[PDB]
Homo-oligomer: 488 residues x 3
């Protein structure tokens, strides 16, 4: 043997995975990873977020103090979960802007209630109904005070309560809507009631409407629920000639991370940052396809059910078994110890060795990409709706749909673009190792065109190792090689 | 002739088109295609979407049953088109939340009306006005029932209508606003009217306001229009001591693809998926600059009036007419049969041949890109407004403007980035064919530096063809070539 | 000296700056520039936008004509600035949809007021209060007319005012809310008041609510403020049996660039296109981290406090002082005159020269990128809120947060992607100059593997200059070089 072959090549695998680039619709790589979380455990983890299971109670029924919700008094949450099974079992009521009251109480994160010393002169307090049983007898909302006539008169109620504290007070109050003119006069002497609740800049002016509503728990009557916020330095005044459902005091308002979610998923003893109505999901992936409704440190919702990011190079796996070949022809499935390396034929037979510098350079770039590819949101907007509403709901749905489409586009582009760069940097390290070998060899070898060098001199395993190391002296073999090349 | 020249080159065209990349503000390519649809036919195609021309009717006037809109009874649509010419010709009315009622009826896609057997005891039904002529005599809205006194009394009306069906019922009802106290007492005996319309969870409480409004079709009086949805299992109760404009029954509510658009474009017998107020547009392009208002499978609206995607490579078109040159100097306008190929000078004169593998590889990548570059939206938000409104309209306009700017950015970046990759992959196939030729030739040729090889041996057309094929044996010419190179 | 060394290399700097690419977390470049404006001067520049300092006045108090705001009569602005110090000093009032009235007046950009000849028959005009002093005596809002009884009667007021102009008229009017039934009867004879204000399609129906509000400037009474727009051809009718706070005329409505901002930043005599509440900012950078609230030609708000765009190439700065080396080993800190160039050792010693073509090509591409990297928004949505409101505020905040996150993502990706292309194009120009030199030299030099050529012939400074120029004849040295290469 007067010559040697030194082939440059890269690893390949028997299986392999198809991914998208900018340049190729489908290209096989050695390895890929999923960027879309498509699976939930089905359970909401009660750590690290404080989960409050509403059970049979909406947040509003906990707020008002519906007797079967009295267990939620002074409750606090990071996430209130309202169940499908929830029912109201007190006086039948409406909240004109239900969604807003639900939202601002949810965001406050507390039903911390402070009873205040309201003095109601010339009226009988603590009115009850058989539609709102507490214990054996008739009762009412724990946080509201049903005022009616004393003897045969109902005076103009005119009370004030100053806010001398350094936080916002939330006052929940109501207006009674009697079923008949008979019912109006019996409870509140005047034929037409009135509830004015004001601060220095704000006022609410509500007139009760007499009439039969649908029978609920015995009653065709209704309470309409209102709220007033009073800031530090400001004051509350309540003025009524009838139909006032009075506050007992205020809810202490807070700022921070608290929200509310509709889910029937059971609460479990586990740890997960990200909550969806389907259950907790892991947040290791940048994107998720489980639910557009999320709470906590979550992947971004996208329309795609899968996105495959390349974590490896292009995968390139008839009687001629002796010959060796390089990267121009194909990859090497035998190459265990590295991504790139050498195969040679010489005096001492066939050998193979990985190159760790080229291998590590490729791995370090891909790991750096993965590091950057792998935000916490708390109270957001509602994304599902049980009633048709028109304009506001149309805008809420259009905002979320706009968002999903823009992030879905961002996710599609990012994966295609990074996959393009991963193919390119992995091809680049192969070419760099071939060029680096070419430059060492000088005039002692020529390019066989298959990603291998024909070395035109005796090059034993020690000689080959010197090429694989930095240290090969072209000069010591130059005479021998030039003679082999340019004569025979 | 002891030598040959083999030049590697690519095609060019006399004309050419400027495009944007990341790296170059303007770069000439052989071919480009438009990604922004900037043109409409001016006509809405009535296929495949069911178009309902409102003609002289708004959707609300079709809903209420304004006599000149009676042709729209039980009508269904995918897209209702409201015309500028539309007029109301019945009782003068307002709809407090007009936009929401218009939106939820539009989205429902039907005026399927089911008359119900409401019994109105102690009142005269079917009230009419000269402001709402049907035939020769006075009339009213087809879907509403104007109730007034019978003899000299108007009782407390207290009727119920249960929803035992498995769909949502939409009830349209109204409150009459008389011009004078005289007019109030004459129609409805009580000096002050009342309309309470409720379900188990919802109630609406409306008090009529007596006063002169502007004279419209004889009248300073007005009807205010309200709606109530009642779900399966729930019930409607209507309670009034006066001024009730009664429903005759319900509209059957549906979910799906239906919407409404303001346009004066004529309806034509043609096929187009995408509808704009300017007329139908083709949807072959990813983007459009015609209108931010669209219906159906449409290109995304962007601010740009043109975006040019490269579908070809860089376009590179003094006494020395004999000599040939390669891709380093320029492209070849003569190259008819391919994108890349060969030019040679030898014993048998000057020849030229295209390389189909390199040509097809470039074409297949570009066609794959185009395949991915070439969403259906139905009911959205309003994007134009005839009245100033403040907060809600500001948010609707800000949402749409936010969207347009983000998609305009996405379109600008995508075209620049894909154009960068198209230039790079087209340059790459040229370099790959030059390197592939270099490797075949081994020590029989050297690089002339103009993208041509000087072959240092007699290489006839058969020899050249063997280089253009896979099959060239450097060994059979090596002796001859080394002698030609390293002596003379 | 029978040989020469010609090294190809690029410049480097002692310092250098770390930037992000797609491929590298951190990579050192010779130069970089900031894309995020993080600094304000602290002052709003009064050029080129017309700034109106509200001083002690909100826009609404300027509109209504609160005496201490009478200096703002007929005022116009591009940007109204409301100060924290602003106070109201007239009749205590609420505006049911304050934010909308504030928004549509701000967007109109004018308080141009036209007094109209309203005739109020059977009522005493120009009612005043000690809570609204103008001069020594009691007064009222300049733009409103407080109507009360004349003698002992208050008739049904029924006035009309047609719009025969070709612009929209904005009418500001109000309803008085007395503290007691005593106060209602004394001012307006009827026990229950009424204000109906209508156009042909629109009507507002307001009933006053009697009751004590919190004491403000002597009074527990309140005025509620309403607005009506009347288009050309349409007409206004006002109908009241009491409590009407009458308009004196209309505000002329305009379309265009006008908005409003909350700021305590002082107004200065300087020029800046972009205004934030923190003060004016320069708009040379694409992005800014100062405030999501902006007015004018502004950078886009992003979460990042810094983004570094590469404006230069990769920065690559033991007894062996004689030897020279090329770009494979490192960059040259000595290279003053260019980005790329040549170093050589020959008969006449060591030399160095820059290549201007390669240098200029790299600079022109980078300057073109910077040109494209370096939008005006006027009236937008509110982005900060002094009160909790629920649903609408949740949507306004969610829209802005959605926007910030999408632009922050766009800015992160764009910088990483352009930096990737800047590294690649700067590496490319180096490789192109090395390949261009290689092709000139033909068989007279071989690649030393350090980005230098060993020229195997005597190559003096004139010979080297001919290589640096286009004009080097390999043939004249070929014999000498082949002899030097393939013998000794
Ligand atoms: C305005 O118009 C509305 C609607 O028409 C009226 O509201 C209805 O009012 C009646 C009561 O006046 C409700 O009818 C039923 O009342 C029963 C009371 O029980 C006693 O009376 C019945 C007489 O038939 C006896 O059979 C019974 O033994 C008792 O002696 C309830 O028992 C009924 O309950 C309902 O729910 C249960 C659930 O288990 C069912 O089993 C029953 O079948 C039934 O569905 C029922 O409530 C009726 O519900 C009201 N309807 C609505 C829609 O609200 C107003 O009264 C009227 N107002 C005025 C002033 O006239
Ligand atoms: C509260 O205040 C409002 C506004 O001031 C009043 O509303 C106006 O009411 C009057 C009717 O009382 C309207 O005036 C006109 O009525 C005409 C009726 O026709 C007969 O009477 C006139 C007497 O001048 C004769 O000329 C005519 O031959 C008939 O005998 C209409 O014909 C008028 O029509 C209008 O439109 C036509 C379109 O073709 C034009 O040709 C006319 O020029 C005219 O513009 C007109 O309607 C008046 O329109 C009402 N104005 C508004 C703005 O609504 C309320 O009456 C008042 N209420 C109370 C209780 O006092
Ligand atoms: C419904 O309920 C509300 C709230 O309870 C009542 O509103 C309060 O009304 C009273 C007046 O009736 C307000 O009290 C004070 O009135 C003073 C008037 O000055 C004279 O009277 C006092 C008698 O104590 C003398 O001391 C004084 O010398 C005068 O002769 C004001 O001077 C008070 O001013 C306030 O602000 C100044 C700021 O400098 C402070 O210095 C004072 O300490 C004080 O804070 C004060 O206004 C009281 O403010 C009202 N409260 C609210 C919350 O509105 C309604 O009167 C009641 N309605 C009915 C019909 O009963
Ligand atoms: C195919 O590609 C995937 C994704 O790059 C490779 O999986 C990743 O492998 C690395 C190294 O084994 C894992 O890193 C380790 O993670 C654990 C847990 O955080 C940590 O304790 C260790 O210190 C280390 O950082 C990484 O988690 C893992 N990623 C995933 C998503 O599974 C995989 O190795 C590749 N497969 C083959 C056969 O090469
Ligand atoms: C310049 O580039 C454009 C865009 O790539 C080329 O136009 C495209 O040409 C192809 C092949 O001729 C067309 O494909 C055909 O489309 C029809 C209709 O769908 C189909 O029936 C055929 O089977 C085939 O797929 C393609 O539609 C057409 N695109 C456009 C937008 O016109 C064009 O060929 C290039 N010009 C030159 C001179 O090379
Ligand atoms: C490092 O990179 C920065 C950014 O590319 C270079 O700063 C830029 O330098 C150019 C040329 O000196 C400046 O252009 C000039 O701008 C002025 C003002 O508009 C104009 O009158 C001139 O005709 C010219 O166009 C450019 O403004 C400047 N940009 C910034 C942001 O400072 C800088 O030269 C580089 N540093 C080194 C040491 O190479
Ligand atoms: C809910 O929390 C509030 C405090 O936020 C409790 O109010 C205190 O009640 C005790 C009763 O002995 C009083 O001594 C305190 O003065 C009250 N605090 C304040 C700030 O007024 C309230 O008792 C709690 N209720 C429940 C059911 O836990
Ligand atoms: C998470 O829950 C949502 C809502 O329950 C699921 O969305 C529904 O999925 C069903 C079953 O595939 C479809 O029939 C409906 O069209 C979906 N409705 C809506 C409103 O989205 C979602 O598929 C669940 N995801 C996972 C992974 O469990
Ligand atoms: C509109 O459609 C409804 C059905 O959705 C029609 O209602 C039916 O009318 C016929 C009249 O003979 C009755 O026999 C049916 O009982 C009605 N159906 C229901 C479900 O109640 C209605 O007639 C249609 N009207 C028009 C003008 O086409
Ligand atoms: C589609 O229709 C819209 C609305 O009519 C056009 O937009 C207007 O275009 C005119 C004429 O160029 C301008 O004067 C207006 O400023 C535009 N108004 C609005 C509200 O956009 C649009 O140009 C039409 N496009 C096509 C291609 O016909
Ligand atoms: C505010 O501007 C309006 C014009 O927009 C002024 O109204 C004019 O007042 C003069 C007074 O002599 C009359 O002659 C004109 O007829 C009025 N114009 C119109 C269109 O009616 C108004 O005077 C200005 N007020 C202030 C304080 O500057
Ligand atoms: C511009 O002004 C805003 C609002 O005053 C500043 O934002 C606040 O910054 C302070 C101090 O860093 C923080 O404590 C607050 O959390 C921020 N509040 C809000 C609502 O953003 C902003 O930092 C200012 N920027 C500059 C450059 O002056
Ligand atoms: C082979 O790759 C495919 C890619 O879709 C994957 O689903 C499968 O699990 C892999 N199988 C093995 C045995 O590695
Ligand atoms: C030449 O190219 C330009 C590009 O703007 C195009 O507008 C024109 O139609 C072309 N002309 C011919 C004859 O191909
Ligand atoms: C050196 O570069 C750093 C980059 O962070 C910069 O902050 C510093 O001002 C520079 N110093 C000099 C002397 O150029």
């Amino acid at each position: 043997n007067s010559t040697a072959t030194l082939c440059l090549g890269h690893h390949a695998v028997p299986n392999g995975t198809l991914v998208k680039t900018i340049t190729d619709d489908q290209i096989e790589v050695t390895n890929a990873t999923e960027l879309v979380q498509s699976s939930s455990t089905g359970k909401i983890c009660n750590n690290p977020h404080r989960i409050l299971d509403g059970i049979d109670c909406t947040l509003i029924d906990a707020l008002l103090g519906d007797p079967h919700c009295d267990v939620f008094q002074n409750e606090t949450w990071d996430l209130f979960v309202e169940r499908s099974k929830a029912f109201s079992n007190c006086y039948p009521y409406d909240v004109p802007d239900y969604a807003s009251l639900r939202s601002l109480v949810a965001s406050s994160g507390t039903l911390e209630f402070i009873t205040e010393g309201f003095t109601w002169t010339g009226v009988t307090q603590n009115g009850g109904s058989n539609a709102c049983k507490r214990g054996p007898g008739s009762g009412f909302f724990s946080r509201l005070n049903w005022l009616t006539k004393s003897g045969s008169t109902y005076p103009v109620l005119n009370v004030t309560m100053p806010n001398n504290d350094n936080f916002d007070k939330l006052y929940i109050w109501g207006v009674h809507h009697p079923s008949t003119n008979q019912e109006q006069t019996s409870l509140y002497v005047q034929a037409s009631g009135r509830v004015t609740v004001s601060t220095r800049r704000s006022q609410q002016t509500i007139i009760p409407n007499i009439g039969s509503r649908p029978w609920v728990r015995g009653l065709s009557s209704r309470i309409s629920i209102y709220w007033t916020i009073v800031k530090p330095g400001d004051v509350l005044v309540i003025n009524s000639n009838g139909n006032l459902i009075a506050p007992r005091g205020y809810f202490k308002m807070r700022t921070g991370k608290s929200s509310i979610m509709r889910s029937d998923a059971p609460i479990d003893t586990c740890i997960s940052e990200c909550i969806t109505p389907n259950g907790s999901i892991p947040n290791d992936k940048p994107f998720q396809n489980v639910n557009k409704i999320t709470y906590g440190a979550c992947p971004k919702y996208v329309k795609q059910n899968t996105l495959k990011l390349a974590t490896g190079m292009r995968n390139v796996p008839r009687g001629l078994f002796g010959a060796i070949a390089g990267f121009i022809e194909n990859g090497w499935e035998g190459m265990i110890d590295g991504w790139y390396g050498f195969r040679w034929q010489n005096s001492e037979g066939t050998g193979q060795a990985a190159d760790l510098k080229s291998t590590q350079a490729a791995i370090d770039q891909i790991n750096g990409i993965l590091n950057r590819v792998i935000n916490e949101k708390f109270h957001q907007i509602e994304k599902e709706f049980s009633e048709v509403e028109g304009r506001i709901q149309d805008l809420e749905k259009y905002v979320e749909d706009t968002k999903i489409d823009l992030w879905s586009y961002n996710a599609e582009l990012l994966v295609a673009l990074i996959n393009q760069h991963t193919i390119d940097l992995t091809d680049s390290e192969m070419n760099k190792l071939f060029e680096k070998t070419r430059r060492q060899l000088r005039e002692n070898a020529e390019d066989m065109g298959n990603g291998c060098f024909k070395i035109y001199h005796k090059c034993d395993n020690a000689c080959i190792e010197s090429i694989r190391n930095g240290t090969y002296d072209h000069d010591v073999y130059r005479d021998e090689a030039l003679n082999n090349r340019f004569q025979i």
